[model samples]
Target: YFQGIPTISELKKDRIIPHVFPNDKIDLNVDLFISFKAGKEVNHGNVLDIAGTGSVPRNIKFSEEPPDGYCFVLFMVDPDYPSRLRPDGKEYIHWVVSGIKTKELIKGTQKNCVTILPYVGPSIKKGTGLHRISFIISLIKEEDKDNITGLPHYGEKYITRVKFNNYESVHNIAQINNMKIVGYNWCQIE
Candidate 1:
C-alpha cells in the first residue's frame, strides 16, 4: 500500500507465493523496510552484495506502527542452502525474532524482542550460488505472542537448520495459533 515496495501481486509474480506466503492478501498496516547497510535497501527480487563476512548487520523497520494489543514476528530464511545443485539444505533459516510489541515498533528496534533463533548471515562456504532469502513479517495477538514457539525450527528443540519446511509448517502453525502474516519480502543475496 506504499511506494517503492513490492505489492502483494508483485510478490506473487516473483514466485514468493505459496512458498513463504499464500495467494491471498497479506497487506499490512505498515510498510517494512530492510537494509543490509545504510542506503543499500533490498526490494523485491533485488540482488545484493554479501561481503565475505556475516558481521554486516541488517536494519529493519516498519513505516507505521501496528495497532495496540498486537505484535510482530520477523523471520529470515534462505530457501537455497548448500548450493542449488547439491540440494542438501534447501531452506536454511537464518534468523527468527518474535514478540516485537507496538512499543518496540514505535522506536523501530528489537532490543527487547525474543530471539526464537539467533541471526546467522549467508553461508558463503556451504552455498555457492546466490541464495533466495525470504523475510516474512507476521502479526499476532499480544497474548499469543508466546506462541511463536512450537514451529519446526522456530523456538523448537530441533537444532537442525536445514530444510526448515517453511511451505507446509508456517501457515498451518499460524492458523492453529491465531496469527496472521503481515507480508513477506525477498531478495537474492550473493
Candidate 2:
C-alpha cells in the first residue's frame, strides 16, 4: 500500500532540478560518506533534528581518497527556503569550502583552504515545514582548479540569497572541470 509514496529521487527531481543539479539524470555513488553528531547517527537520506541556532558539526569518512592529483570541494545546500510549499527562494547555499585536501577531510581538517563561503547552519522558518538540506562533496581536477575562480563574498552572517549564484552552476562547472562526486548526504529540517 505504501508503494504509491514518492521516493527521495522524485522529491529531489521535483525540487533540486535546475536549482541544484543541471538535470535529473545526474547520479553519483556515495562512497564518500558523511556523518553528523546532531545527538544521533545522521544516516544518508534520513531525517535529523537541526532545530537550533548553532551550526551542526559534521564528520566525513571516505572509503577512498580522490585520484593522485585531485582534491575535494564540499558544500552544504538547502533547497527549501521561506516555505517548502512555496520555495521561491530555492537552493540556498549554507556553506562552501574549496581546495581541500582529500586526506585532510578524512582527518577532519577544517582549516588551510579558501573559504569561498563560510559555514552557516540551517535556519528553518518556524512554520515553514520540512526543509531539504544536502551536503555534497565533489572531486576537483587539478588542471581545472583555476576554473573555480570568481565566487561571491558571503558576510559573517548567512545571507538568505547569494550574489553570484555559483550553487546553481556547480553541476555544470563540475562537469566542465571533470569533478566527480565522492560523498553526499541529505536530511530534512522542520
Candidate 3:
C-alpha cells in the first residue's frame, strides 16, 4: 500500500474503484480530495469512526474549477460492510445530495441543493473486516436537477442497499442518470 497519500490503486485493490468508477481507467487519478470533520476531529487517512456513528461535515475541495454552469452531486457508499468478498449488501448508500454550486461548497455554505438522500452514518458488521466507505462526486449540468424527483426508494431507512437495477453499485445509477464522476475519497470502518 502507498504510504501517506491514498492512491487510486489502493482504492482499486479494495474494490472501490471498480464499484464506483467502473468505466474509469485504472490509472485515473482523483483530482478532487474529500475532507470532513466529525465533531472537532478531522478525518485522517480516510478512517471513519467505527465507534462513533453520526453525521460528518464534508469539505470536498477540487484542484481545478469545473466549467461554468456545472454543479456537483455527492454520493457516499460502503462496499465492504457485510463482507468484502461476498458483499450481498454492497455499496450501501450512505448519502446523496445534488445541484450543489461549487462556489457555495468552497464558501462553506452548501446552498441550493436538493437532498435526495440525507446523510446516514456508516456501520461495519462484526468480523466483516474493515469496510471502505467511498465519497464520490459527480459533475452535472444545472438543468439535470429538474429530472431528479423523489429520493431513491430502497426502504424507510437511509442506510439501505443501492437497489437501483436490483444491485448495489454506484456506477450503475450514476451512468443511467448521465452523471460523470469528477473524483472521490474513501475511509475505513472496522
Candidate 4:
C-alpha cells in the first residue's frame, strides 16, 4: 500500500492491479457506496465505502508534488437514492459530486470542492436507509487554479458522472454494470 508519493502507474501495479479481477470476477476498482442521512447519527451523514472491498485513500500513489498552479481532484458519487423517478416510475438522479484534489482525502466537511461536505448523497424522501453499491470510481485529474475558482467552480464542471441503476445487474455485463465517470477537468502544465 503505497501512500503519499508515487506515480499513477506505480500505484496501479502495487495496489489497483492486484484487485483488477479477471473477466469473470466483478470490477470493484471504480465503485463508491454512499449513504445519506438527514442528521448526524451512526448512519446519518453520507458514507464512502468502496464496494465492500476497501477504500484506497489511505493507500495508492499520489504524484510527488503536482505541477505549480495546478491541482488534482478525487471525485465521488452515488446515483441512486432518490433517483428522481419518472412520472411513470423510473430512476432519475439524486446526488452528484466532483472536483476533489488528489493530494487531499475528501474528509467530511462543509468545504468547497475539497471534501464530502458540499456534495453528499441523496435526500431520503421517506426512508431510513439509502442504497449502496459498487457505484464509485476514484480518479486523478489535473486542474488549473483558474479553472477551479469562482462560482463556476463550485457548481459542477470537473468530473465524469454516470448512474448506478443503469444496468439490471453486475452479472453477465461486459462493460461494467452501473458505473459512472461523473466529471473531470484535466490541465496541461507548461
The candidate scoring highest on TM-score is: 1
Candidate 3 lDDT, tens digit per residue, 11-33?
66666656656634533233555
Which tens-of-lDDT digit does each residue in 1-190 have in candidate 1? 2345567677777556655565655665556667676656667877777762264345676665656877788777776555544545355567777778643322224655776777776655544666667777777777776666546444322243444445334555567767777756777775
- RMSD per candidate (Å) reads 4.5, 5.6, 4.6, 13.4
Candidate 4 per-residue lDDT over residues 57-105, each given as its tens digit: 2222233333344333333332232332322212222222334443333
lDDT of 3 at 15: 62
Cα lDDT for residue 35, model 1?
67
For model 2 the TM-score comes to 0.69
Kindly give the stretch of ten consecutive residues in candidate 4 with the minimal lDDT sum: 181-190
CA lDDT of every candidate: 0.62, 0.58, 0.59, 0.27
The top-ranked prediction according to lDDT is 1
* Candidate 1, lDDT over the whole model: 0.62
Give candidate 2 regions above 4 Å deviation.
1-19, 22-24, 56-58, 103-113, 143-147, 155-169, 172-178
Sort by lDDT, best first: what order?
1, 3, 2, 4
| Cα distance off (Å), candidate 3, residue 121 | 0.3
